[PDB]
Design a binder for this molecule. Structure first.
Ligand SMILES: CO[C@H]1C[C@@H]2CC[C@@H](C)[C@@](O)(O2)C(=O)C(=O)N2CCCC[C@H]2C(=O)O[C@H]([C@H](C)C[C@@H]2CC[C@@H](O)[C@H](OC)C2)CC(=O)[C@H](C)/C=C(\C)[C@@H](O)[C@@H](OC)C(=O)[C@H](C)C[C@H](C)/C=C/C=C/C=C/1C
Ligand SMILES: CO[C@H]1C[C@@H]2CC[C@@H](C)[C@@](O)(O2)C(=O)C(=O)N2CCCC[C@H]2C(=O)O[C@H]([C@H](C)C[C@@H]2CC[C@@H](O)[C@H](OC)C2)CC(=O)[C@H](C)/C=C(\C)[C@@H](O)[C@@H](OC)C(=O)[C@H](C)C[C@H](C)/C=C/C=C/C=C/1C
Lengths: 116, 117
């Protein structure tokens, strides 16, 4: 299904993982596969398909706010689409070469593991 | 004259001379730069903001890798430098994902666009 937030964040469950999938909660280290796109033109700026999974501690601001919120509650094998407003990404200013000012971002994220 | 080395292995080379009285990147000032970043061992460019909005940071507070805090210091607007940055002054043993492996030397070309205060 779909959840929207008043700030414009959209979190869509694309597919469910197996029933026994470990759950991602704040403070857990998680491993994910992702494809990241600029929402304005569908240009893919990064993916780790065919690469080592991306590991981070959920809920500590290591990653953009849209990920901390959007990955929370995933179970192993779940895939979500996150449609992230600038305020939950890199803001008005944008970021480096990769992210223009005022960028809406779309990520497809698959939860690979959770360290309980 | 136009190359300086540091005991940690950093090399700072002046590529281009900007404005003679151009505002100077001094510690504690917010500075705006254009850059190209390359993995030295295979010459793979991992990022650049050339032709895009400049990158702003506060110099000398550890918000960026050590090689930048040291290497950008003293630039004047319009200057360009090449930084040859050892792992200890970059991403060290951990690296930065697959694009920047453990124990990687980095090279950056950096151009100073502006200094605020
Ligand atoms: C080469 O590839 C990059 C990732 C690239 C950069 C460019 C962007 C387009 C992108 O392609 O990822 C991208 O797809 C993206 O936007 N990502 C990556 C996947 C998670 C979501 C998002 C993100 O938040 O990235 C992150 C985004 C760019 C920066 C953060 C945004 C939120 C903000 O609160 C944070 O403040 C801290 C900074 C990058 C990361 O996920 C990496 C892992 C983490 C950090 C750098 C910070 O958390 C830092 O905080 C001190 C740390 O704790 C780290 C471990 C310290 C060590 C030395 C540095 C490691 C650096 C690794 C860098 C990696 C693999
Ligand atoms: C999307 O693009 C990324 C930049 C990418 C990430 C991946 C690397 C390959 C790279 O492509 O840049 C790259 O070319 C690179 O290596 N850079 C960027 C240009 C400066 C030199 C170097 C660097 O130090 O990056 C930095 C490197 C990855 C991490 C730092 C390395 C030194 C270490 O001491 C720091 O510990 C603290 C962490 C990223 C940055 O320059 C950004 C600005 C700074 C931070 C995230 C931290 O300082 C953080 O700590 C709380 C902050 O104080 C910030 C301001 C808080 C706000 C909310 C977050 C802003 C996030 C911006 C993210 C940006 C533009």
């Amino acid at each position: 299904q779909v959840r929207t937030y008043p700030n414009g964040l959209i979190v869509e469950e694309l597919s469910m993982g197996k029933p026994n999938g470990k759950r991602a909660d704040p403070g857990k280290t998680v491993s994910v596969r992702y494809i990241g796109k600029l929402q304005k033109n569908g240009k893919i700026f990064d993916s780790n398909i065919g690469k080592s999974p991306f590991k981070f501690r959920l809920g500590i601001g290591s990653v953009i706010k849209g990920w901390d919120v959007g990955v929370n509650g995933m179970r192993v094998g779940d895939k979500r689409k996150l449609t992230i407003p600038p305020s939950m990404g890199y803001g008005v200013k944008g970021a480096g070469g990769q992210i223009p000012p005022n960028s809406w971002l779309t990520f497809d994220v698959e939860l690979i593991n959770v360290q309980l």
